[PDB]
Amino acid sequence: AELDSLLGQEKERFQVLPGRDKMLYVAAQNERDTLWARQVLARGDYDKNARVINENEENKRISIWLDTYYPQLAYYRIHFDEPRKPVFWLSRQRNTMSKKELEVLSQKLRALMPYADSVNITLMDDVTAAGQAEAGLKQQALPYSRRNHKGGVTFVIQGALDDVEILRARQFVDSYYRTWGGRYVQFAIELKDDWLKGRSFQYGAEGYIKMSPGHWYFPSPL
Amino acid sequence: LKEPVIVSKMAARKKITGNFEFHDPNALLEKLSLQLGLIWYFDGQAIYIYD
């Protein structure tokens, strides 16, 4: 029979797409339903050839190809809301490629995905990917420290945070990572206690820490 | 410093640790005597130090 009947009763969670190299690709949408389909190909109730694709798995397979055939490329993410036409979020402020070498990039990427009909490459801005992350980190009233440097920013959330801001920060970073990917802007959640625990120090350009009523320590300038 | 240093025994109970560097110690002694809290005096043969 057909593959759509070989899967579960709900014929809505899988999407079977026909490939161009006489293969038959199955498109799941999370990791739990991928092993559901991988069990089908493992018990062996299908004679022909088939494969199971994903979105996060498919994005780290043609990023290995993009590591050796196109180094120094500033991209963001490949979106698979329609797997016959993926969207390629390419950077705007850090490239110099024209349309012709963008065309030969779409052809070698078309030959990597035999199931897609045409890949669309759209250039996204780079200062709006961080202005929405900065605006989203201020909405939750979270302490942070921005560190601007060339080719990516970094937000450092240190200090002893409590339990209602751990859930509220983790629900925003994992939903920012879902749509933008973690290759340009990196979130560093780090829960640590009070440095210089019950100690009295003297900050700024000539620093010393007092470990006792009669003991002065002179480490690096606090 | 080319002179001996005599610190009294009430100011010898405090402690210190670190990496210090002496090349002009007459300015370095003056700055650390306000941070530690100390008084000193050089009479021409020795340097007396109190708390």
Partner: peptide, 21 residues
């Protein structure tokens, strides 16, 4: 700028911290 973060000091170590300015 400069300053002092005192956590339960004992009024000897406070006025000694002001003994530099």
């Amino acid at each position: 700028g400069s300053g002092f973060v005192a956590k339960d000091d004992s009024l000897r170590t406070f006025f000694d911290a002001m003994a530099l300015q």
